[PDB]
Amino acid sequence: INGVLVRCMLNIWGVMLFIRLSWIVGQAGIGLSVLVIMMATVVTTITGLSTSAIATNGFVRGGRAYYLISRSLGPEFGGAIGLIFAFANAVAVAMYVVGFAETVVELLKEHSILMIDEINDIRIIGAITVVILLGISVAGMEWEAKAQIVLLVILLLAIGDFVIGTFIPLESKKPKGFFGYKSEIFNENFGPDFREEETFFSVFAIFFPAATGILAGANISGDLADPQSAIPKGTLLAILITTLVYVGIAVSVGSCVVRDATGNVNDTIVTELTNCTSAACKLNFDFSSCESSPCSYGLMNNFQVMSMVSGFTPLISAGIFSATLSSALASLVSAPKIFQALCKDNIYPAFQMFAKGYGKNNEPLRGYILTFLIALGFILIAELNVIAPIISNFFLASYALINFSVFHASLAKSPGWRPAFKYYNMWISLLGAILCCIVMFVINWWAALLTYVIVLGLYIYVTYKK
Amino acid sequence: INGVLVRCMLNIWGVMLFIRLSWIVGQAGIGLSVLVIMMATVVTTITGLSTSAIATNGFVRGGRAYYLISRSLGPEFGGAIGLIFAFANAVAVAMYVVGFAETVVELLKEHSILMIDEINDIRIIGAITVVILLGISVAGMEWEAKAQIVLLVILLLAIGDFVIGTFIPLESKKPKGFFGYKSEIFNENFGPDFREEETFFSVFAIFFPAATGILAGANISGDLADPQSAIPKGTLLAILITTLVYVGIAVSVGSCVVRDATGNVNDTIVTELTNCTSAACKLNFDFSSCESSPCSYGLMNNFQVMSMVSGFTPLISAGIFSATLSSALASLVSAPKIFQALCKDNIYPAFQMFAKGYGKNNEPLRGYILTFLIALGFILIAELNVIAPIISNFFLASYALINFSVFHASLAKSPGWRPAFKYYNMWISLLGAILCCIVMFVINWWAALLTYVIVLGLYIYVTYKK
């Protein structure tokens, strides 16, 4: 009730927190953003209750995450969810690491230093980073147990430092959108003023990965040093804490940083008593009239608002490093584990090359190379705002699959289904599945369709390979 | 090999032939229109081969169409295809009858006569028409056997009269877009010049019902006075003939009527030697410069181009009446038959009120009232261009269902599957199903999605009612 809790809590706080939440709230108002977070959290908690019901039905010996599912679910749903989820984690590696690389090139361009083709300097940085990350994962993880705790200490210190910065309204940040909890800054920030082409569901898709750390946080750490049936409590409480801190950070940054701010001491508080519609003039002449040209930063231009508000910004940057690298590595170790587990069962005998445990320990290698290559291929696409909707798609697909499969097995299944989680009925799981599918189709309907024909073909193969 | 042949050939030539084909070719060029027809016909013929394989597997005693399917397919696919297809025919009634009503108000407004709210005078006409059609269907059909033959004589005479009119270039039609097989009229008509908001798939969806008469043409006439295993030959040959005459009428009208023509002897052949880009001036000053205001008619303005080209236009109008009324009535008798057959089996016991055969013969009444009311509700929507995509959706769904179900049963099914149709393998049926689903999603993805959750809920009900 402490190990997998910390694991999920690490997996969930990812890149989208420090570098995208300000974005989201800047586009979808302080109000509607809460609806975004609430939809995300209801999907996640439906899936959490369902996966809990899974984690409280079978034998006490939880072999492997995918093996746990295959025990508690048919090989059709088993292999489907497994493959689609391992792919989800594989692409998630690239998502997290490219967010990291983005913040690196940001903190670097802040200096005098520069690189070749920033839009692809991100690509070079991400490549070196994923190489070093694979090198970390393979050949050693004994230290990760103690490393996750220090990472979480760093991360919580970063969040607390952010909030402690909010209450400290330095005048030098007046040229930035930060103003320190003004009511009118909150008023003007409640209406969902969107931007160039984003719609509510585009923003939701961007945000959704920031709520996706639950299953691999819990299940992938099957056979935990803790009892198996402790997973649900920690998973759900972690969901609650993460979503609550999401809501808090959301409301705070919305009531703190204005929609746009061209940092210029010149364009400042000179205080000509004008018409004064927006909240900027309400504060002072600072951050006035970005409507003409694209301004530098503030809640809708730059993603560095979080690092801009807090005190001793190094701690916030360290928190970013911790979150992104940690989540990326967790996904990078969970994905090939699922691959090798599914392949050792030879459920899909086409990928019979289960990496043969090429190592002194049971360290798969073929899966590592595969997911590393996928991560590279996706890293090549730089703009995180386009990688993230794909992860959104695939994780929504995975969640739909899993909770729908629970719903289906609930339709009486001779295989020992017999779950135990309080509040784990079928109808809520069918609700979650319909929600997942609908939401997935609203965000790039054709991607969802293609995903579904993929899983259909998987059902075919699993149906006639028997 | 003559009865169900004539039946399908009647069901297929519907309203979309005489009043929409000219439209389609006017928007999607003489060339691309052939691709439209080819996609339609490949879908239809895949489904035809599959339904043939069905019609050549089971007992010699073909009880009922839906019963034939339930014999040769599981009650899941059975009831799904049955309900969705009966609904398809129900809405098809309204489609055909509203096309009829449209041509009636056209031929009436051509006179001095008029009605109240033409856009809903169509609705009033359609209501009276569907009332009279229900009155025809119930309480007597003994004459329909001899009536279909005279209807087909009328229809073929209309088509032949149309083509015989093409070769007769009356000067009085020069103010209309008709010119009589000019090469340049064909050249300018090969490029898919679309219009206000139509896309290739919008046009395809409009067209697709014009290729949907096969299953109900053949299966609904189960226990034919002909042997059961004669269905495939006639069905496929009817498909071939209908699609070939579609291609012929398409190429002809494309090479005959220009894209736009403001009928005015004044704006005519006066023959000022201008720049002359379009083919109009190539012919003469007639039908020149519709680009300014919306012109009266010709291959893109009015749907009466077909009736405008032929000689003794009354015959063409009679052919329209024959086609629309005939197809409408065939659908109106096929839909409730499927309803009462599915309900007598009580597959979906919610609709246990199977009309109890309230009549001296086995004449269902509850189903009649139901489909009549649905037809009314849809008639209320007047613009055929919006009703037709819905029928396209639902028929694509039905075809996807049926051929996919054949594909699935091909994955070895202990129920006696054992078909016989030459060239009836699985892979082509899976191809047809994937095509149906993809095409259905390109045309109003959310309608397709909703249809699929409907059939999923049906799978639920059929799964836990057992």
Author numbering:
A (entry chain A), B (entry chain B): 288 to 753
Give sentences copied directly from the paper behind this entry:
Cation–chloride cotransporters (CCCs) are secondary active symporters that harness the K+ and/or Na+ gradients generated by the Na+-K+-ATPase to extrude or uptake Cl− in various cell types. NKCC1 is one of the most extensively studied members of the CCC family and plays pivotal roles in trans-epithelial ion absorption and secretion, cell volume regulation, and regulation of chloride homeostasis and neuronal excitability, among others. CCCs are homo- or hetero-dimers and their C-terminal domains contribute to dimer assembly.
Here, we report a cryo-EM structure of human NKCC1 captured in a partially loaded, inward-open state. We identified a human NKCC1 construct that eluted as a monodisperse peak on a size exclusion column and yielded homogenous particles suitable for 3D reconstruction by single-particle cryo-EM. This construct bears deletions in two regions (255–278 within the cytoplasmic N-terminus; 941–1000 within the cytoplasmic C-terminal domain) that are divergent among Na+-dependent CCCs, as well as two single mutations (K289N and G351R). We determined human NKCC1 transporter structure at 3.46 Å resolution that allows for de novo model building. The final map shows well-resolved densities for the transmembrane domain, large extracellular domains, and loops connecting membrane-spanning helices; however, it lacks interpretable densities for the cytosolic domains, consistent with reference free 2D class averages that show merely a cloud of fuzz densities for the cytosolic domains. NKCC1 assembles into a dimer partly via an interface formed by TM11–TM12 helices within the membrane bilayer. TM1 and TM6 helices lie at the core of the transport pathway with broken α-helical geometry roughly halfway across the lipid bilayer where two strictly conserved glycine residues may serve as flexible hinges that could facilitate the transporter to isomerize among different functional states. Ion binding sites are organized around these hinge regions with partially charged side chains, main chain atoms, and helix dipoles playing crucial roles in coordinating ions. In contrast to LeuT and many other APC transporters, NKCC1 seems to harbor multiple extracellular entryways and intracellular exits that converge at central ion binding sites, raising the possibility that K+, Na+, and Cl− ions may traverse along their own routes for translocation. We intentionally excluded K+ from our sample in order to arrest NKCC1 in a specific transport state and accordingly did not observe K+ density in our map.
